[PDB]
Design a protein around this ligand. Structure first.
Ligand code: 5N4
Length: 299
């Protein structure tokens, strides 16, 4: 098939400053930082993932870099480069608002219908691109959607390609992963958004989900959802994978809705709700001179 002509950019350690720790766990530690290419007179806000050295860990971080460097879409997270220190470091464009799951939980009192519907379009665009690239995500969830600006989200953690509660029925029973099992997870992601970060099948142990789905029970209709929106989620949760919507259809359907959002989502005090915007002033710590976003920096 087609040769993967993606460029793997190797970055010098001396070209990037670590500022603060955004997270830490099993994967290692993620830092907020700046990338300053020598003589370029640019400072690019970045997220840096660093790993002690073991041959197993290094193999895993490089498979992640291969996938991340292979994608290029406005609604998918891309790798900027890698740093070849003792433990390999992955450099990515900073998504300053964090992940969508925590964003909806923390900002539920100001998330209006235009935002939820546009996020649904953006995630479907990202997913439709991954489909054109024949790349099955396998882990789509609201936690794996990053927020660049409240009006611009990008999918991530497709680079690892078990979350039973987001998985399709063919995936649970037979470990069948396709672009149509990705549609089921998309339906769950939408449910997460529409409920402002609620946990799907909360308090129901994972080893029971398969039987629940086989009996025909599904996630409930969120209070803000009209039957129009809920029918879409229900269509993502059909047993027949071919019956589920295509991402191309999801972009269209949610875009139609996004044009008259209050007809499709019923949110109390929707028209007086507001989030930060790049059309606003003061939207953009120490020296903020010469900083450019990675989306506007090309070579
Ligand atoms: C905030 N932001 N902006 C771009 C990327 C990220 C980010 N990446 C993460 N994991 C990564 N996965 N792959 C990477 C490559 C380079 C840098 C980071 C990662 C993780 C998080 N955020 C949190 C703290 C929300 O949890 C983990």
């Amino acid at each position: 098939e087609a040769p993967n002509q993606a460029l793997l950019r190797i970055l010098k350690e001396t070209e990037f400053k670590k500022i603060k720790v955004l997270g830490s766990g099993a994967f290692g530690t993620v830092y907020k930082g700046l990338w300053i290419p020598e003589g370029e007179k640019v400072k690019i806000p970045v997220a840096i993932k660093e790993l002690a050295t073991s041959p197993k860990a290094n193999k895993e971080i490089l498979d992640e870099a291969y996938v991340m460097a292979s994608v290029d879409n406005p609604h998918v997270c891309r790798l900027l480069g890698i740093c070849l220190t003792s433990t390999v470091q992955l450099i990515m464009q900073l998504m300053p608002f964090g992940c969508l799951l925590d964003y909806v939980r923390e900002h539920k009192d100001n998330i209006g219908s235009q935002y939820l519907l546009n996020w649904c379009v953006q995630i479907a665009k990202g997913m439709n691109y991954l489909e054109d690239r024949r790349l099955v995500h396998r882990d789509l969830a609201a936690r794996n959607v990053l927020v660049k600006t409240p009006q611009h989200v990008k999918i991530t953690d497709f680079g690892r390609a078990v979350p039973i509660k987001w998985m399709a029925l063919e995936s649970i029973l037979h470990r069948i992963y396709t672009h149509q099992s990705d549609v089921w997870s998309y339906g769950v992601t939408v449910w997460e958004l529409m409920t402002f970060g609620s946990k799907p099948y909360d308090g129901i142990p994972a080893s029971e989900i398969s039987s629940i789905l086989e009996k025909g029970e599904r996630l409930p209709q969120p209070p803000i959802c009209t039957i129009d929106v809920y029918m879409i989620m229900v269509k993502c949760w059909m047993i027949d994978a071919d019956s589920r919507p295509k991402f191309r259809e999801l972009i269209i359907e949610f875009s139609k809705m996004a044009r008259d959002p209050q007809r499709y989502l019923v949110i109390q005090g929707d028209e007086r709700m507001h989030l930060p915007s790049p059309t606003d002033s003061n939207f953009y710590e120490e020296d903020m001179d010469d900083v450019v976003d990675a989306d506007e920096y090309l070579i």
